[PDB]
Design a protein around this nucleic acid. Structure first.
Ligand SMILES: Nc1ncnc2c1ncn2[C@H]1C[C@H](O)[C@@H](COP(=O)(O)OP(=O)(O)OP(=O)(O)O)O1
Ligand SMILES: [Mg+2]
Ligand SMILES: [Mg+2]
Lengths: 321, 538
DNA sequence: ATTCCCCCCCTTCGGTGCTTTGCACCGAAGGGGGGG
């Protein structure tokens, strides 16, 4: 099926990040196997397009798999339990005019030899046109306990007493709860608050304007969803999915499952996989992720724990929540 | 002769056409060198004497090789490179000797006239047309066109590197046990065979390359140690960098100092404890690369310290795959860090340094994490493995930092080492308001037109103060208000601000910054014992 | 005086996003080193 780029859009030119001896060895074994059956073919430097490639060990299988970061290419192309479908995508050939963009470069340990470039001769795995040219599948992931998905309400702590701090914070968990939850226009608290004293009805009327959930906030299929993750401490992760800021389509909490009190990146990587899987079955689009992590930290380690055939777009926040 | 290898198809970018540049004048001896090299390549079939039709031209010139007696012929292909399609480079990095395993047999080879052996695509040969001028500018020149890859064209390196890989693939397919390191045309060949038994397989490679038109003269065939490879000096058991000469120049200019910084930055891979921050600070503000820069007493000491480090010999060792990598980081002052990588203690694989200040406000923990990430990426590049770190940060300090930080951070398997300079958080903002301590409600609000702010504090127990600020902004004035609150409080204060900006600068627990005000706030925060900080909406 | 290509570091300037029209961060382009 003739596939083409977005008019005015050329093709991916992404560099290849370094890999580990064990990933390279798996990639060489896999690519040699595929090249001998015609799925891929060697190319030269006359092809100026490149996409990053990396290998992942699938869950409870001990068998390596090849993953190509077809994120730049997919954004430029003009076109419940889960299991694999990419395998079958190897049975429909590509278009000779399009094969030039699906090119990767396997690196070498200690830069021993120039990288070995390949290109696809059939439908790749991770390319949005792939499902197309070819119950719900995302693009290669063909679709856990989706019987309990809801929106965590915001709640001011319930106990007793009131500190010029508990109220000085209260007007904070409140005045911020405005573009999000309207109705709490309470303004009388500025009487036991702005007053200068040591930090050492409205309440329930808003504890009710908070009881009510993510009112309205309906989804439009024009703007891609945005997901922002917050680290609450000690393996506690909370996320918010909003199309336009200050109106949440869905919010949730991710507690400590993996990387017990030692690995933040393992927890963050699995949370991203969890939220993305949630979105696909209900919205169908991978949200853009605002990740509470540095640039170098995420790029180095996210491949070590990744277990999903799809890769969503993401940005990294730089300011406190 | 010329490689029977298949030519790589090359095209110009669509709409674009070939060059039509002229030839610049040349020195009378460069003309002779150019015409002799050119009579040679024409006899060998590397250029095809063109003539009365070619509407293309490109300037040519010559330099002197490292041989100091031969000339290299170059073509200024800048306009053609602009008009030529884009190529994807296959050279992803430079091989390092620290990633080389000890091999009993080692030999280094060099392919003579490496580029002039790989053919150039027939349709692209017209665009490479050039004119060799006239001896003593008199007669019309003898013009030629390139039948092979030219030196100066931007598609030549990638094409040559792919062609060499395609040539060497048959040899590596039938001979797995020899390691082959190909950098352009420089070949490092290692084997687990004896001398009299791997020469037989080296003379086999020398004939396999010669079958594809790739010659290998025996004046750049190194058969005995020490081998000069990739700017190093490979010994049978160790390796080192080739001798490094540092300037002894009385008056230093900007370029005269950037050369010094470049030399030390390259010597820092093996030599330990190399610092350039005091010298690299002399390269700020100044932009004219000819003015005599006076050497500050801080940079003079760094030059004095660096030159005695380069006075004693340093040599690394080779990788042993049946071992674990150990990296030992050390804090050496002013945000500069030094690390050493080894498998056996006191025998370094390679040394390094880290002095990059990433961000406006940062502390030692974040800098150490950045250094750890850099070392991890570099080690994965060289050895394909993640090393084990000997960090000077306590386990409890790292636990405190990472359990109370919004940003997710991690460090791979590591252990703590007792070195005098340790990584610590100099202060900690507390969670609950302190009894017995007064409050310092701060506001510094400015005027965006006259640049006039009002920085002050108000206390619950009847104490207020206000200081007019000029030439300041909204954020600078409230930072100054926080500083004023810290200045006149006892050894315990409760600071409540209206600033989500000043909290971020302070909640992250920095210890140094370029901003003087933030440094003064940090300095005063260290003196205070227990501090609480919270934001309110006005 | 005149070229290309790769890796690294160090400094400077423009673009971006949020916000409090400053401020902080990042990417690309100079200088240098090394390599062929
Ligand atoms: N200064 C340079 N400018 C452009 N290309 C260069 C330069 N130095 C080296 N190269 C490229 C082109 C060369 O063919 C290739 C290999 O370098 P080198 O071996 O020194 O040259 P060579 O093979 O032409 O000469 P030699 O006969 O001395 O080996 O690298
Ligand atoms: Mg050489
Ligand atoms: Mg040579």
């Amino acid at each position: 099926v003739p596939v083409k780029l977005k008019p005015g859009m050329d093709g991916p030119k992404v560099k290849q990040w370094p890999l580990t001896e064990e990933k390279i060895k798996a990639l060489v074994e896999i690519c040699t196997e595929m090249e001998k059956e015609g799925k891929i073919s060697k190319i030269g430097p006359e092809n100026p397009y490149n996409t990053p490639v990396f290998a992942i060990k699938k869950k409870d299988s001990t068998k390596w798999r090849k993953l190509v970061d077809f994120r730049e290419l997919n954004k430029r192309t003009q076109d419940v339990t889960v299991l694999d479908v990419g395998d079958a995508y190897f049975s429909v050939p590509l278009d000779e005019d399009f094969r030039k963009y699906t090119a990767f470069t396997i690196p070498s340990i200690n830069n021993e030899t120039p990288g070995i470039r390949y290109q696809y001769n059939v439908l790749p795995q991770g390319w949005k046109g792939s499902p197309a040219i070819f119950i719900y599948q995302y693009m290669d992931d063909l679709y856990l306990h989706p019987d309990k998905w809801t929106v965590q309400p915001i709640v001011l702590p319930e106990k007793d007493s009131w500190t010029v701090n508990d109220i000085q914070k209260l007007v904070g968990k409140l005045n911020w709860a405005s573009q999000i939850y309207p109705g709490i226009k309470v303004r009388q608290l500025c009487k036991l608050l702005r007053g200068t004293k040591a930090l050492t009805l409205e309440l329930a009327e808003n504890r009710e304007i908070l009881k009510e959930p993510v009112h309205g906030v309906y989804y439009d299929p024009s703007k891609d969803l945005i997901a922002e993750i917050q680290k609450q401490g000690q393996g506690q992760w909370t996320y918010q999915i909003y199309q336009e800021p200050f109106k949440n389509l869905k919010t949730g909490k991710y507690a400590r499952m993996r990387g017990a009190h030692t690995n933040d990146v393992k927890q963050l990587t699995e949370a991203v996989q969890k939220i993305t899987t949630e979105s696909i079955v209900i919205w169908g689009k991978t949200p853009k992720f605002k990740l509470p992590i540095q640039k170098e930290t995420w790029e180095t380690w996210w491949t070590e724990y990744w277990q999903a055939t799809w890769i969503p777009e993401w940005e990294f926040v730089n300011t406190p929540p | 002769p010329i490689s029977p290898i298949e030519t790589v198809p090359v095209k110009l970018k669509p709409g674009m056409d070939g060059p039509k540049v002229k030839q610049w004048p040349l020195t009378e001896e460069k003309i002779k060198a150019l015409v002799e090299i050119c009579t040679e390549m024409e006899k060998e079939g590397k250029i095809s004497k063109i003539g009365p039709e070619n509407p293309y031209n490109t300037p040519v010139f010559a330099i002197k090789k490292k041989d100091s007696t031969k000339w290299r012929k170059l073509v200024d292909f800048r306009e053609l490179n602009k008009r030529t399609q884009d190529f994807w480079e296959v050279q992803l990095g430079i091989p390092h000797p620290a990633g080389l395993k000890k091999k009993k047999s080692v030999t280094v080879l060099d392919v003579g006239d490496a580029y002039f052996s790989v053919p150039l695509d027939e349709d692209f040969r017209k665009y490479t047309a050039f004119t060799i001028p006239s001896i003593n500018n008199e007669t019309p020149g003898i013009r030629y066109q390139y039948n092979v890859l030219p030196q100066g064209w931007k598609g030549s390196p990638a094409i040559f590197q792919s062609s060499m890989t395609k040539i060497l693939e048959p040899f590596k397919k039938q001979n797995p046990d020899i390691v082959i390191y190909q950098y352009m045309d420089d070949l490092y060949v290692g084997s687990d065979l004896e001398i009299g038994q791997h020469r037989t397989k080296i003379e086999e490679l020398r004939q396999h390359l010669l079958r594809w038109g790739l010659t290998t003269p025996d004046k750049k065939h190194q058969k005995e140690p020490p081998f000069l490879w990739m700017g190093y000096e490979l010994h049978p058991d160790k390796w080192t960098v080739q001798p490094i000469v540092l300037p002894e120049k009385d008056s230093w200019t900007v370029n005269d100092i950037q050369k010094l910084v470049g030399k030390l930055n390259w010597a820092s891979q093996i030599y330990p404890g190399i610092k350039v921050r005091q010298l690299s600070k002399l390269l700020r503000g100044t932009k004219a690369l000819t003015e005599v820069i006076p050497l500050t007493e801080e940079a003079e000491l760094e030059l004095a310290e660096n030159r005695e480090i380069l006075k004693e010999p340093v040599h690394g060792v080779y990788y042993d795959p049946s071992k674990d990598l150990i990296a030992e980081i050390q804090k050496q002052g002013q945000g500069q860090w030094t690390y050493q990588i080894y498998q056996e203690p006191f025998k370094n694989l390679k040394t390094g340094k880290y002095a990059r200040m990433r961000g406006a406000h940062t502390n030692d923990v974040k800098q150490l994490t950045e250094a750890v990430q850099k070392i991890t990426t570099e080690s994965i590049v060289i050895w394909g493995k993640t090393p084990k770190f000997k960090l000077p940060i306590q386990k409890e300090t790292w636990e405190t930092w990472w359990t109370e930080y919004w940003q997710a951070t991690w460090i791979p398997e590591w252990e703590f080492v007792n070195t005098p300079p340790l990584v610590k958080l100099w202060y900690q903002l507390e969670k609950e308001p302190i009894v017995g301590a007064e409050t310092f409600y701060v506001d510094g609000a400015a005027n965006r037109e006259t640049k006039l702010g009002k920085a002050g504090y108000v206390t619950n127990k009847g104490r207020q103060k206000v200081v007019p600020l000029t030439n300041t902004t909204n954020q600078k004035t409230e930072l100054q208000a926080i500083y004023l609150a810290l200045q006149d409080s006892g050894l315990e204060v409760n600071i409540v601000t209206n600033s989500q900006y000043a909290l971020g600068i302070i909640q992250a627990q920095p210890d140094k910054s370029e901003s003087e005000l933030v440094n003064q706030i940090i300095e005063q925060l260290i003196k205070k014992e227990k501090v609480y900080l919270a934001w309110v909406p006005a």
